Design an enzyme around this catalytic site. Structure first.
Site, PDB file in Angstrom:
ATOM      1  N   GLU A 161       0.937  -1.218   0.073  1.00 37.24           N
ATOM      2  CA  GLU A 161      -0.007  -0.090   0.104  1.00 37.24           C
ATOM      3  C   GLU A 161       0.984   1.331  -0.133  1.00 37.24           C
ATOM      4  O   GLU A 161       0.832   2.166   0.769  1.00 37.24           O
ATOM      5  CB  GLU A 161      -1.085   0.048   1.146  1.00 37.24           C
ATOM      6  CG  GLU A 161      -1.957  -1.147   1.212  1.00 37.24           C
ATOM      7  CD  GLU A 161      -2.871  -0.896   2.152  1.00 37.24           C
ATOM      8  OE1 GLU A 161      -2.681  -0.497   3.370  1.00 37.24           O
ATOM      9  OE2 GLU A 161      -3.948  -1.229   1.804  1.00 37.24           O
ATOM     10  N   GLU A 241      -4.373  -9.499  -1.070  1.00 37.60           N
ATOM     11  CA  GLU A 241      -4.515  -9.360   0.287  1.00 37.60           C
ATOM     12  C   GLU A 241      -6.046  -9.297   0.254  1.00 37.60           C
ATOM     13  O   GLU A 241      -6.849  -8.074   0.397  1.00 37.60           O
ATOM     14  CB  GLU A 241      -4.265  -8.474   1.187  1.00 37.60           C
ATOM     15  CG  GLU A 241      -2.495  -8.669   1.330  1.00 37.60           C
ATOM     16  CD  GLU A 241      -2.164  -7.438   2.315  1.00 37.60           C
ATOM     17  OE1 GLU A 241      -2.807  -7.123   3.280  1.00 37.60           O
ATOM     18  OE2 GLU A 241      -0.849  -7.593   2.555  1.00 37.60           O
TER      19      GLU A 241
END
Ligand SMILES: *[C@@H]1O[C@H](CO)[C@@H](O[C@@H]2O[C@H](CO)[C@@H](O[C@@H]3O[C@H](CO)[C@@H](O)[C@H](O)[C@@H]3O)[C@H](O)[C@H]2NC(C)=O)[C@H](O)[C@H]1NC(C)=O
Ligand SMILES: *[C@@H]1O[C@H](CO)[C@@H](O[C@@H]2O[C@H](CO)[C@@H](O[C@@H]3O[C@H](CO)[C@@H](O)[C@H](O)[C@@H]3O)[C@H](O)[C@H]2NC(C)=O)[C@H](O)[C@H]1NC(C)=O
Ligand SMILES: *[C@@H]1O[C@H](CO)[C@@H](O)[C@H](O)[C@H]1NC(C)=O
Ligand SMILES: *[C@@H]1O[C@H](CO)[C@@H](O)[C@H](O)[C@H]1NC(C)=O
Ligand SMILES: *[C@@H]1O[C@H](CO)[C@@H](O)[C@H](O)[C@H]1NC(C)=O
EC number: 3.2.1.23
Lengths: 304, 452, 452
Positions: A161, A241
């Site tokens: 991220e 994820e």
């Protein structure tokens, strides 16, 4: 009989030895579970039908003090990868150097902070030097474990991220990518993971590096993969994820997501033919000081 | 080392940021003038990759055309918003430095705002810019340097090369010129022949041309004064310019159409670089155009849609990112005023090529797209043959292999020691746009000096 | 009326059946010989639409190439299984009759199986087939008739036209020939010029050619005996044939590659129609090829992949539907044996064109693709100029409009009364394959006699 794994842009997939391939993976952190039990979880993972795992290498777990490295026994990540290979499982390696992961300082060693104004996850020369040294230590251990060298490592994450971080440094990412290519070779498949919104990929993606997103059950799946395709017009759809549950905080009520809701979403993802990793498949344990924190401050508990 | 204030943080419209470093800024031309540069590092081992300078032609056109539309690291899609990486970009194996020259072209400018200039001033400004570049990026001084360009840069490059030959600090290793104007005489003659053999003239015109413009096997299409000869040449130029053909690619479509309405708004599009038929008495249609206040005029190539590149470079977020002073006005691929005020000085490139050949240390290659009429391949092959050099390999074709599709012919190559002529079959003025992959294979073998 | 036994119930590989009627059968050639025909009715008002006959060339090639791959009502996709309607098909405004001629080509045959023939026999067989056609489809006798073809059909068509001119029952309204071989002499000469001006020869070769093959402004590339001249011409032919260029489209790729391995299986591909450089002493490479039993040989065009059309016509369900006797062997676009045993008789088309021009009643148009080398546009423009006819319109370019993309140049046109020459910019030997829409617009204006 040569092992030729590479992304098939034409047919939006992976190719393993010339055959179409997509992976169904689960995350397992060898470090949040004692080595005594590694095999156990991994075998359960195989028995669940996963053909790959997605795991983090926490830099701080192996180098608590600068230049001091621990890699044996409970510290022997390479043995963990070898064990996975012995079980017939492939490996997606995520060596950071930042892993988030509700793990202490995102994997970065606290002694980096000996320079008071130093900046992490940026082009800070001292940060980049320390990162480079860590990579130069860790990555040659992973090299023989790469798929093309006969091991279980098929893809490698460079960040996590990154679009959520303030710096938006593409020089930093380029520096990482150059060093990864240098130590690991051009053959490796490199990918990123970011939140499923183009705003994060804006600062996360990078040329010469595959782009992927993550998202759970509260995201439009069509919109998420459209967002990915806006950055990867060709190649496999990948959710690195897909959250099966969620983290906890002390005091905050334990998060619970209904099983069958996750099951339905997983089926939906699979029906598109994408690649999905279940984060987490096993959570394991928050040892002595391995927990992380969010802001406003809220430490994660011992249970993971 | 590198100027941090020039580094590009990002480029809008691009979904994934480049994997190589790229800078955009200004290089010191003559004190008032400051050239606009765009340097893109190699995508593999830039520290040791050769440095290739790129100049466009005109005179008065931006070198950012070869980058954003021909062989740059990324290309503008038709939407003029999105940028897509180019699998056939020249920056895959070399560090390319694009220079908008002379001052006034693109983002280049001068304190005095004197856009008028000439061959000598442009050459001196280019040399001073190269010196500044090497002083701003000392780490690339050692890298092998190559001077490349297109069209009018066929004059710019060799004259500048003579200057480059006087600087021992520049590691000049070779030079390459794409579809360059080696000789106005050889160009006009080869053009007339091209036109006849390509069905553009006709037997009536051909017969009249041979009667009024030639000796027995000698034709004079350069400075012929015979009245009907000049009339025939004027008709030829009318046909080439404003009958609907694409002077940059005979076999390609015309963007929006030229033989229809002249313009649709109050913006006039000029497509005469004034480098062809210069010794022929042209009609002054320029005074015919309104000179009243507010009559905006821009120079664009014939049948070429420059909208996309303009809308990209003129986008506030891109201009900001590229460190371009908000003061400077709108961006165009070619500057009309620059062309109008340009002063041509050189007649032929004979002396320049002789100067470059005398050292016998540099590898030079001239490549021409076989469907161009601005600098047709024949004129440049004639020029090179007129150079009377030692032949090293008799003319033959060269091949290129495409993904699972067998060997294919890409052109013909003539090799004399240190200088070579090559054709690119199917490519127009902008060779990278028509034959990207072939252009890359030829460029790669040139730079690497690997014989074909 | 129509022969119900010939009607096509359906064509496999096509998802939706045609909206027009189409027949496939045999026409009475000489008693033993039976030509294979494929008639396709107009897609709008077939009862009153003109009848256009189509013949391919070779000699020895199937007229089913123009249908299945150039301007037929449907085209074979690369899979060689699916058929897609063509928005640019010639059958949109006319009733097209495709004839595989002579006997032995495609599905044509003879009782005696004597594939050997000659110009006169082929012309007589074509005339007898046309008579049979008009006796099998009396309803179309009144429809305006046009004779069209390509390549070698440039000989076939005018000689046959002289026969057509002798039959008052055939409503001959005009004639059109695409890239036809008007004159071997004019073709070889224009080809040598084309090669030099297209960068195929080189200045060394050009100089030698001018020295050994020409008078002052006169060149003899037809029957020149000068030794080194013949050697230079042999080198030219080597370069055109087996150096990697596509004689049908200079600017197009080569299917699978010719300068690689000669063949990959025990099937030999020949690409010499033996119509070029016939008076030049060639090397007998045919005896070099193995003559042993089981050595299958087929004639295919150079760099053309005939697989798809063969796999379609050779598909049992298609052969059945098309009423093709199961006895006949496999299908090829061109028959090697037919070409080998073909006997050329005509030298130039001068007499044929003079015979057609003397009546001054028919509208004739010759159109050539400007990237072909088998029947280059220059040779046919020279021929037509050598016809010394009255000029009606000075040469000029013609335009075509594409969907919201402005006017574009499609070529140049020379008009003399009743006969016209036209070029198609960007088209090769198979004009419909390279410029479908332009081919359709030109065809439509020709058939409808609408002046350009
Ligand atoms: C030169 O390139 C520019 C690139 O922007 C072209 O502009 C684009 O042109 C297309 C086609 O005309 C436009 O699409 C049209 O959109 C309207 C709705 O606005 C729609 O009704 C039409 O059917 C068509 O889809 C597009 O909007 C336009 N975009 C911009 C930013 O200008 C331009 O047309 C090109 N001109 C030439 C002569 O090549
Ligand atoms: C001429 O046209 C024919 C049309 O059928 C071509 O045949 C087709 O060629 C393609 C490409 O070689 C074949 O696709 C291949 O399929 C295999 C699996 O069988 C796959 O592994 C390859 O990656 C590729 O996708 C296709 O099967 C084949 N079909 C038939 C019916 O032959 C032929 O290749 C063309 N040849 C030339 C020289 O143009
Ligand atoms: C997701 O969004 C797309 C378009 O934005 C829409 O078609 C689809 O129905 C949405 N699905 C869900 C589950 O939100
Ligand atoms: C080019 O222009 C400058 C302007 O001052 C002038 O000094 C110079 O002489 C010109 N070049 C030539 C060759 O005259
Ligand atoms: C063509 O072949 C036939 C075969 O019998 C022969 O009779 C005829 O004379 C030939 N044509 C010419 C012009 O000789």
């Amino acid at each position: 009989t040569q092992r030729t794994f590479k992304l098939d842009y034409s047919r939006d997939r992976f190719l393993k030895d010339g055959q179409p391939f997509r992976y169904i993976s689960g995350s397992i952190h060898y470090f949040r579970i004692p080595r005594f039990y590694w095999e156990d979880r991994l075998l359960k993972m195989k028995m669940a039908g996963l053909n790959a795992i997605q795991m983090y290498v926490p830099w701080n777990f192996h180098e608590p003090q600068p230049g001091q490295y621990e890699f044996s026994g409970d510290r022997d990540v390479e043995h963990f990868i070898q064990l996975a290979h012995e079980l017939g499982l492939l490996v997606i390696l995520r060596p950071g150097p930042y892993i988030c992961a509700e793990w202490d300082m995102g994997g970065l060693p606290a002694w980096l902070l000996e320079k008071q104004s130093i900046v992490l996850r940026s082009s800070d020369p001292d940060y980049l030097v320390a990162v480079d040294k860590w990579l130069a230590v860790l990555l040659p251990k992973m090299k023989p474990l790469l798929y093309q060298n006969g091991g279980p490592i098929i893809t490698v994450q460079v960040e996590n991220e990154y679009g959520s971080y303030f710096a938006c440094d593409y020089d930093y990412l380029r520096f990482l990518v150059h060093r990864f290519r240098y130590h690991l070779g051009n053959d490796v498949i490199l990918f990123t993971t970011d939140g499923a919104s183009e705003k994060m990929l804006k600062c996360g993606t990078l040329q010469d590096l595959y782009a992927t997103v993550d998202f759970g059950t509260g995201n439009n799946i069509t919109q998420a993969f459209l967002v990915q395709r806006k950055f990867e017009p060709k190649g496999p759809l990948i959710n690195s994820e897909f959250y099966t549950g969620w983290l906890d905080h002390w005091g905050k009520p334990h998060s619970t997501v209904k099983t069958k809701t996750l099951a339905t979403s997983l089926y939906n993802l699979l029906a598109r033919g994408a690649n999905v990793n279940l984060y987490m498949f096993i959570g394991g344990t928050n040892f002595a000081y391995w927990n992380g924190a969010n802001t406003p401050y809220e430490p994660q508990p011992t249970s993971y | 080392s590198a100027p941090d204030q020039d580094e590009i943080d990002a480029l809008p419209g691009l979904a994934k940021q480049p994997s190589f470093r790229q800078y955009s800024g200004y290089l010191r031309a003559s004190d008032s003038k400051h050239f606009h540069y765009w340097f893109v590092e190699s995508q593999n081992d830039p520290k040791n990759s050769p440095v290739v300078l790129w100049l466009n032609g005109g005179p008065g056109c931006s070198s950012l055309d070869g980058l954003l539309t021909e062989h740059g690291p990324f290309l503008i899609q038709p939407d003029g918003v999105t940028l897509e990486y180019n699998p056939y970009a020249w920056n895959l194996i070399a560090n390319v430095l694009y220079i908008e020259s002379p001052a006034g072209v693109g983002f280049s400018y001068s304190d005095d705002k004197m856009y008028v200039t000439n061959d000598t001033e442009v050459a001196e400004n280019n040399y001073e810019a190269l010196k500044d570049f090497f002083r701003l990026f000392p780490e690339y001084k050692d890298n092998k340097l190559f001077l490349t360009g297109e069209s009018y840069a066929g004059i710019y490059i060799p004259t500048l090369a003579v200057l480059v030959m006087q600087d021992p600090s520049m590691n000049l290793q070779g030079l390459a010129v794409g579809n360059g104007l080696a000789s106005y005489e050889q160009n006009d003659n080869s053009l007339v022949y091209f036109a006849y053999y390509h069905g553009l003239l006709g037997n009536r015109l051909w017969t009249s041309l041979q009667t009024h413009c030639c000796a027995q096997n000698k034709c004079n299409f350069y400075d012929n004064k015979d009245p009907e000869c000049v009339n025939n040449l004027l008709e030829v130029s009318r046909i080439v310019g404003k009958s609907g053909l694409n002077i940059y690619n005979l076999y390609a479509p015309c963007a929006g159409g030229v033989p229809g309405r002249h313009r649709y708004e109050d913006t006039l599009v000029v497509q005469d670089f004034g480098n062809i038929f210069t010794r022929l008495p042209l009609k002054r249609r320029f005074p015919e155009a309104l000179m009243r206040s507010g009559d905006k005029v821009r120079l664009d190539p014939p049948c070429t849609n420059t909208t996309a590149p303009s809308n990209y470079l003129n986008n506030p977020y891109v201009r900001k990112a590229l460190h371009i002073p908000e003061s400077l006005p709108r961006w165009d691929m070619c500057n009309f005023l620059v062309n109008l005020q340009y002063r041509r000085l050189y007649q032929s490139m004979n002396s320049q090529y002789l100067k470059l050949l005398s050292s016998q240390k540099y590898q030079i290659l001239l490549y021409n797209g076989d469907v161009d009429m601005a600098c047709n391949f024949m004129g440049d092959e004639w020029f090179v043959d007129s150079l009377n050099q030692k032949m090293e390999v008799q003319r033959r074709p060269w091949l290129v292999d495409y993904g699972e599709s067998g060997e294919q012919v890409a052109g013909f190559v003539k090799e004399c020691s240190h200088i070579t002529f090559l054709t690119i079959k199917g490519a127009g003025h902008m060779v990278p746009t028509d034959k990207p992959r072939a252009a890359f294979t030829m460029f790669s073998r040139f730079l690497n000096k690997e014989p074909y």
